[PDB]
Symmetry: D2
């Protein structure tokens, strides 16, 4: 587009970090290979670490995390030629002046028709340095609006409750416009999450069914086999609710429950997401079951409390089932089950829309229909229903109408961060967390979170690799999800 | 269960015929192999032809049409041991007395506890001899009710209009109870047709959608590659409407449109089928397109009028598209497109429930959802809907949630006549055409049929192997089915 | 019609009784005056009492209960000329032979073209003599079918539970066809009860709303100021459930809950009433509140237990609130509140269809819509809804769209028995309790009734003239009816 | 509440005019009497006319148009004491400086706690002087924001098509904020129009019915007995579409069709009105019938073309029926009939929501339900439905559930301008035409209007006092409104 006619500089701050090498640079590599970045793009790493050999770091460390190298015919050296590194602090104005000048040098070397350059700052940094970096960038590394735009990609956590998150947003207010800020929730870059809006509002079949008349229960599920060992106890102060429920699953919740937007423009969609989240009744201790994993039966995985970085009397939940209510006319009386756990029997992210029983004329010879959207693994959408048992026997059984992407489509689906970085470069804010959207999410869970920190909510043990605490399943059953 | 405790005699009248060897005996073979008939069942062929060698006829002719011989270790000789043949006329009382005595011999040889025997008479005969055979059987070959039941399986045609069919039913009235008569419409034995009732009324998902609020158009389609050559001009006096639309597709129509029945008992289901058929507005010349096939482009297939058994100025349609209206609150304003043709590009039987457009917010970037039930070939049910194009491109495309039986299920689906004969033996009348059900069907088409015979409806040519006359597609389009 | 061309004899058995003079003869008088009976009709009273002066009894006693004498110009003497009286027993065949002969004499005196005569037997008798009278009539007072019809009007009670009622029906089976029996439930002759079917199924507005998607709760209410004093303790063995709930309010229940009938013919309507009643979950002790009235506060009305004809430890309920569930897809989750009491603050029969809350955007500034059908007093139908407060204040209030019959229509509505007798003469069984309809009703309440007789259900006191026991209101509230 | 704590000055520009004396001052009088204005309010008339005696003008002319004088004991002299008059031009800055100073004098004389004063400018002036007056006020008669607000009440016409109206809005843009501008459409002050939003969204009964599943046709009707004589030909350049359809009836249209708003705040409501108007398909010549009134049959009223101020070959329509389509999922396929005419048989403003037929089981013995909202005369809301004919006859008839305000409520409903002026003083913009709302309305009708001016749409004659041209009724019938 017009992205090609003007210089483009992508600055990865914290380029020496975990996210940078595992997600950011690999996503940028894929975007380069698909012709989604300009050939003459400049990617500038920025961090406090001194690089003795930049070429070696790029070839050995960075390139080690690139995927799909062999299948498609894209040269790695050409992409690495676009990457520079630079050393500097995250607080001193002298270093942000140096950063600006390095960008200027790259912008002047741009050979295209138009002058100046567009600047994308990716903040792959810890929350402790966030505000200082935003102040330095705002003060001394902004392009003037006439010569190009500035966009900020920022990562979670965004505070740890309503109050802390609001303070953080207020510090950003005078530094950047909300247009310029792109808050990542990387689940919004996943294929099947991106398809929710199309599934709901492009299809009469689902439009007509998507309310309390037909829907009995909605379940949103997150499972991982991995534990929280080797983090350095970073998880202990966060917990499973702050880590995935407050952001990833609430984002999914909002997409599943919002009204039809006025258009497909970014703000019309985000307006509806905020609108519905403000109608969610805040979670409370009585309508949740918490869990903290213990050592596995086979002995391989040690317990949460055996991690040397966690205090011995920690309430930190690694597992949680919540029952939420959305108080409006579309959703009244429909229980929303949100569950998320680490150290479980499988890796899973799925959405289950369980419809009401058709009581007659089949009674107990049928069961509830269910729309299942599985985002990972093996992404698929399928509709569970009752049919006649094939053949001469005249009986019933449950079956599916299936769409499994790896069988139907001959394409490799990109990592979430490829979609999102691309959309940030296009200037589309649809799949990024707006300031008021973030506030609405924290208000749902903050009362519960504060209760948990005071030690008022019981946390149940479960062996790593198990399905979680037994009373989680009983809680789900009485909540209205008929498991079958 | 009680079928085993009393003798069972299945008499195939017209056993020397086309239907007998191709459908009847092969179906009985499959039922024997699946343990669905008693091991000591007696199958008695009856016709005017003299059999010089019964064993050879059975081994060479009959066994030639048996399928799945290698798949199971079911012995063919054991089944053929149960078959006898007998010569006799279709009108003389002396021969029906002989038939009775032959049955009596078989019944006496039954070794089980109870006395007498149940008798199933399969009338695989032309319509010319039908009433005479019914009179002979009624008069001189009935079991007394105390010693067993008598059931009559009878084949179409059942008259050629409302009047002729009513006369025929009135002749049967004093001979047999309606409970004893099992009128075949063999499409009701096909897997996907049997599944219609379960699909509609066991599933909230389809229950909620099954009315004029969500449905824009319903299309029922019958196609065959075969022509009507070599029949001896039997088709000329019948036509495509009488041959498949009045029976097969109207049966499907009734299942797709009926209200939810009071229970799953046979008469509760048949009541609903009759109820809805009486609400169908009779077809008329203005809302139909007729066709008669001509010679194929490649030259292999000759035209309908080249068959030496058809008169030269025949109006007989080999192709027809009808638009019907069902006048009730569920279906008001929903056009029903019934189409059926021979000498077309493919063999097909499918049902398409085309839903309304979701107008916003996708507009022309989505299209109508469609539930497709394909009964043959390669039986399947799938739901066409719009989804995001997989990958980085953020676009839409039409896809499916699919259930293809040959991929999902590892079972060979039976021929229609296996299911039906089995259900006749069980005494379940659900999938058999009731006397009033038949009358309701004739009333829909009779006014049109009489108009066609008077030469008042234009019949358009189309080359064999083509898709039919061009104005059939235009008629379908303006009728409200959006083809895409 | 053809009612005029053949003799008509209406025999009122138990003509000396309470029902006869208060309801039967007065209804017949009104029918005569409106030209609904033939001028030459014969009305024959039959009972054991000897009449010293028949003319005086007619002029003084019977005519005393006739209404609307002055407003319309109908002569009383002309009607009384059509009435005869006759003495006889209810068991002796000699007396039913005499009855037959008296009818024959009246039939021969008919001067019209056709011979014979139609006979309507009204059994205004106690249950103790019922079967004996039916046997005598069947044996010795039937018209032959060729010379006219015979119809039996019979009154409740029809047994006192499922078993007793079934025995009674089995005794009637060989005596009369179900076509000939017309079981009275006189609430089906009331204007607003007759209008239920039209209200529901002639109007799209109510058709679309009449299910669990829009309806939150349905309440059916019966109140009387009168007590049960002076009955001679007849009520004590019956109770409020048997007296009005099992029949009157269950009839109303069936009309409010049935599916749309296949046509407006009598059996199509009655089929639907039976169908839905068989889907009602039987009442149980936990979901009811019983009451028995005590002396009024002002002292005028004595308590139920002060009636000298009731035993001192009677459990007999004069008040009852029931919560019923109809288990089907139209009604799942919708509580049905049936309440009925004597010795209450007012006389009332009304039906309240309370719809769900529209939650947004008015919240607590609106309240549940409610359709109210009031059958008595001052029969009316009105729809309670929220509107803007009239004038400059921009607020909300609850108001009504009203149809009060005495204001809108300038007509006097007939007593229930005028409609019903007229419909019995026309041969329309729509508003008469069918044998299977009756059985379905008893099955709903019998388990509860037997529990009450064993003394297992608590009966609460309430002062006559009060609104009933306090915990009845609390039971109603938690059941889901929001009173406002 | 805070309106009392600061000075209030209401300036009526064009106070010598028709609107001022007939609507503006009388409305202000009513607001004074109901305690809705502060007792120490200042009302300042402003116009070019010189007033020889201000007290006489107030007492004789102005007070002549006040109503409800006797009904309350509200003193007229007290209100007139609050009115001043002042002479000045509409273009000279010297006069707007004088105006400012006169306001300042009144503000200083305010005795309450706070300083400054709020200023409401009512522009009761012709469109020719509009922009000049807005410029003068903006330049030299604004209160500074710290000392009070400024609000502008402005009257139609707002241009004569999309282009002219857009230019006008662009001239206002730099002079006033959209928050300060209150564009009058006085139909939004009428009781029954104000109640539309409450009727639709506070009631489950109407919420559930308000879409194409239940609604067959919506008709909005405007009729007047008065003609356009004596106006000086002012109407000729405007026509009925610009005069009432583009504004009054389109406002009603938007309220009847909008989605449920996110809240009851002004901008949430106005957003929905704009949203739906942008989905209305523009009117076109084929889907309209135009009329121009001729002399009445009785001779009293002369024709439109006999008015000496109209050119002889005028196409100006005094009557118009339009069929509009709203292209979204709520309204697809539902025809909207807008009709408006002068010189007709009656004065009427009503809204008719005609529902679909309930086809079974009553067929032609029922008819379409209809919700009727009548704003004038004799304001009422009623629901037309089918019921059993009262009494012994068992037939059907159409009746109503009625709410007639003059019978139900003992209150005199205010003129439209009382509500609106009051809401402007409160700062509630809900019932005022927003800039984008206005643009959306012009886009609906502009293509049609330009066609009419070019002389491409036929204009039919009709006698004054008649019901309009005959082919208007035929157009309505084929459009889908069943008149009965
Ligand atoms: N073939 C098929 O797949 C279908 C068949 N049907 C129906 O099933 C029935 C049987 O069909 P099909 O088997 O094709 O019929 P056929 O023409 O093969 O006749 C069946 C048998 O009946 C006897 N028969 C034939 N013509 C006469 C006659 N004029 N008078 C007396 N007997 C005669 C013959 O036996 P014999 O001379 O030895 O007595 C013959 O073997 C028919 O009613 C047909 O309409 C319906 C749909 C499809
Ligand atoms: N009358 C009604 O009910 C309705 C009115 N309206 C709108 O309200 C506004 C006022 O209407 P209305 O009161 O009938 O208007 P008028 O024609 O009565 O004019 C209003 C006042 O403005 C001044 N004026 C009139 N003509 C001119 C001119 N050519 N140049 C400068 N000043 C002039 C006069 O005062 P002076 O000469 O003393 O300065 C006059 O008293 C208009 O915009 C109209 O479209 C809309 C719908 C209905
Ligand atoms: O679709 P199927 O089961 O092969 O049956 C098709 C045949 O069905 C028969 O009933 C018709 O008479 C034939 O004309 C038709 O070809």
């Amino acid at each position: 587009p017009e992205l090609r006619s003007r210089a483009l500089t992508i600055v990865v701050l914290g380029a020496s970090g975990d996210l940078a090498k595992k997600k950011t640079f690999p996503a940028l590599f894929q975007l380069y290979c698909n012709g989604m970045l300009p050939r003459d793009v400049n990617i500038l790493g920025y961090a406090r670490s001194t690089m003795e050999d930049v070429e070696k770091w790029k070839k050995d460390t960075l390139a080690g995390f690139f995927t799909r190298l062999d299948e498609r015919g894209c040269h790695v050296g050409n992409f690495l030629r676009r990457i520079s590194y630079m050393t500097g602090s995250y607080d001193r104005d002298e270093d942000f002046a140096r950063l600006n000048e390095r960008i200027l040098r790259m912008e002047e070397a741009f050979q295209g028709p138009e002058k100046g350059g567009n600047r994308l700052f990716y903040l792959a940094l810890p929350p402790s340095v966030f505000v200082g970096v935003c102040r330095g960038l705002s003060k001394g590394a902004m392009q003037k609006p006439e010569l190009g735009w500035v966009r900020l990609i920022v990562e979670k956590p965004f505070g740890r409750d309503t109050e802390t998150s609001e303070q953080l947003s207020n510090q950003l207010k005078p530094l950047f416009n909300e247009r310029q800020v792109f808050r990542i929730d990387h689940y919004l870059g996943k294929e099947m999450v991106q398809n929710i809006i199309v599934t709901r509002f492009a299809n009469r079949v689902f439009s007509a069914l998507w309310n309390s008349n037909s829907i009995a229960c909605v379940q949103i599920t997150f499972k991982e086999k991995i534990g929280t060992a080797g983090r350095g106890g970073y998880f202990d102060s966060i917990g499973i609710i702050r880590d995935v429920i407050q952001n990833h699953l609430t984002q999914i919740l909002s997409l599943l429950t919002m009204e039809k937007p006025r258009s497909l423009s970014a703000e019309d969609i985000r307006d509806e997401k905020v609108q519905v989240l403000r109608q969610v009744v805040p979670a409370n201790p009585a309508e949740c079951v918490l869990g903290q994993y213990t050592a596995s039966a086979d002995g391989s995985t040690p317990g949460y409390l055996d991690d040397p970085s966690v205090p011995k009397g920690s309430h930190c939940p690694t597992f949680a089932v919540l029952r939420l209510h959305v108080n409006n006319d579309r959703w009244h009386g429909v229980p929303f089950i949100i569950r998320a756990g680490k150290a479980l029997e499988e890796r899973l992210l799925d959405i289950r829309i369980q419809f009401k029983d058709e009581i007659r004329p089949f009674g107990e010879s049928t069961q509830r229909n269910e729309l299942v959207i599985r985002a990972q693994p093996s992404e698929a959408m399928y509709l569970k229903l009752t049919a006649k048992t094939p053949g001469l026997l005249n009986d019933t059984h449950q079956t599916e109408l299936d769409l499994t992407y790896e069988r139907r489509y001959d394409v490799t689906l990109p990592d979430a961060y490829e979609s999102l970085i691309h959309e940030a470069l296009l200037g589309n804010s649809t799949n990024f967390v707006r300031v008021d959207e973030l506030d609405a999410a924290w208000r749902i869970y903050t009362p519960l979170l504060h209760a948990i920190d005071r030690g008022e909510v019981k946390v149940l043990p479960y062996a790593a690799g198990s399905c979680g605490p037994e009373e989680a399943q009983e809680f789900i059953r009485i909540s209205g999800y008929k498991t079958t």
